[PDB]
Amino acid sequence: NNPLQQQSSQNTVPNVLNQINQIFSPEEQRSLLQEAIETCKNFEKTQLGSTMTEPVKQSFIRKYINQKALRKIQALRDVKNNNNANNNGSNL
């Protein structure tokens, strides 16, 4: 009787950026973007408090959103027999 807390497979899952429109609604994405900007200021206060270029901040937001998306996907992975699917087809 070994203890069980959680278990999830780890692997590189590419082509997840295009799935951001399926994982999150655009209205939600806009809110997340605004939150990410505020988060960037939070990051700025702790580290990197000087002249910063725009792409590094943009990359930080993209990484932040992607990490959050992965957590959400993992949260939905907690249900068994649950996976993303197109759910579009026709029987003919």
Side-chain angles (χ1 to χ4, degrees):
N1 288 339
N2 295 337
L4 181 61
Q5 187 63 57
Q6 62 188 69
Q7 185 177 358
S8 183
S9 296
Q10 291 172 331
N11 199 30
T12 301
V13 184
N15 300 318
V16 283
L17 182 60
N18 200 38
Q19 296 181 58
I20 198 167
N21 289 338
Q22 290 172 330
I23 297 166
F24 298 95
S25 296
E27 290 174 349
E28 290 171 338
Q29 290 180 45
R30 291 290 184 181
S31 181
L32 290 170
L33 181 60
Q34 185 177 355
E35 183 177 1
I37 292 168
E38 290 173 348
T39 300
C40 290
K41 291 180 181 296
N42 194 39
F43 182 79
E44 182 180 0
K45 291 290 184 180
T46 57
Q47 290 294 318
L48 269 70
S50 60
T51 301
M52 293 173 71
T53 62
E54 191 178 356
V56 293
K57 183 172 68 177
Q58 290 172 330
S59 295
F60 187 85
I61 292 169
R62 291 291 182 84
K63 292 290 184 180
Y64 179 77
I65 292 169
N66 288 340
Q67 289 171 331
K68 183 177 178 63
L70 289 170
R71 293 293 186 184
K72 182 178 179 180
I73 291 167
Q74 289 172 332
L76 294 172
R77 192 177 295 173
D78 288 345
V79 179
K80 301 294 184 180
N81 303 118
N82 194 36
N83 198 30
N84 290 342
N86 288 285
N87 299 318
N88 184 262
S90 182
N91 298 318
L92 182 61

